[model samples]
Target: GGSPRIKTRRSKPAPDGFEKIKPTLTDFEIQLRDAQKDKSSKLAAKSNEQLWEIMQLHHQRSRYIYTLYYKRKAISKDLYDWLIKEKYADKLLIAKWRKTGYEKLCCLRCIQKNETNNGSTCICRVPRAQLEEEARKKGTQVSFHQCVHCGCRGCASTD
Candidate 1:
């Protein structure tokens, strides 16, 4: 039988607490990726652009970028230097990274090396000094090996 016009297209509204259910930026990243699968379409192009813009505006991404650019040396100097020179970033924020030095940064690229443990082998960006201090505080062996307790399986040094 043919569908009738009386059928509704809209669902019921969400509950009061539903507002708290904000989608993660990672979710947007996934959607952006899926939408990009369509190689040719104005709709998909718009979708990808919007999703990326949303992710770019997220606070966590901004903070992570700041930390990586300065402390981790993952980003080029001009990137953060411009932010400071332009007065867009706080002086203290840039100052902190003045000598923070570089490490492997986050295990983002190493995510490709993730095994079947559901990203359990991803590395951390924490410096050894920080981890050693943390390890001592927690009374655990924190070395250049994968952290069994925290699931950070990558380290800057392999030896």
Candidate 2:
């Protein structure tokens, strides 16, 4: 008797910049360091409100960097150069951090609705067909619904 043969298809690897394009927590380190420095420098001079403002600015910068970095745009050149020089730019860790940040930036209502409604319907309340069509136009193989859930690119729906 002939031995059974199994057939398999190998999927293509991700794009060249895909891994590098993800966000990183390291990007926020600069702002955090700056905040710490400011706090120490003005420890006696700054009021509570001023100190709070500085901290808030740092947090806002971190969140913005997280969003933009994951979107594949180049971040501040100074920070990028610093990371490169320090040799702490791990693509894998960046990718993981991007995923986490993306999750955190998700629509709270959508998440809650999914959990409560078993994810059968989109919490974003958009039609799957329309979402898929938009994704197709963007040359992305992934579905828009998945993109929205994962906070992937090009999945902005007003509804």
Candidate 3:
């Protein structure tokens, strides 16, 4: 007869290294403010159409910065944690969409359900099945496109 004893592994605490890096609202604001400053300069210098192009470029850079901030461990941990917890708390809906093929109708990056209206856009035109198959074969998780039309995700190549 053996004594019924259960052993459980303890989860490790967050590394102390993060202690040195604290989230600062001002710092994050500065990044956005800098982008706005540049945008304003471009607006002053360019024609209406050129200003629109510059604005789009500015927006792209800003979004990229936001994505980097969200993904990185060393910066704005509070904002990152909040976004991760609040924005993606439940995956059930996404899972359901995947199973029902509803995700195909939405932009993969923006999660916009309608492409006709709203600023919601996609970068890739390839169906989800094809993108998934390509990803599986390549063993990589990457967006297929850099959409310039709607500012949504698009495939790398349109062939």
Give a tens-digit lDDT track for model 2, residues 60-96.
4444445555564656655553443443344433343
> How many clashes show up in model 2?
0
lDDT of 1 at 117: 64
Kindly report the root-mean-square deviation of model 2 from the true structure over all alpha carbons: 20.2
Better of 1 and 2 by lDDT: 2
Predicted structure 2, TM vs. truth: 0.23
Q: For model 1, how does the per-residue alpha-carbon lDDT over 1-159 read when each residue is reduced to its tens digit?
A: 787655434334433432222254245456545545543455633454443433333334446546665576665555545434532334543233343442343223332244566653343544467568877888887666543322344545322
| Model 3 per-residue lDDT tens digits across residues 48-103 | 44323433453433344354554554546554344334331223433434464453
lDDT of 2: 0.45
Which prediction has the highest lDDT against the true structure?
2
For candidate 3, report its TM-score. Answer: 0.28
lDDT of each: 0.44, 0.45, 0.44
The regions of model 1 sitting more than 4 angstroms off are 1-103, 106-122, 145-159
TM-score of every candidate relative to the true structure: 0.20, 0.23, 0.28
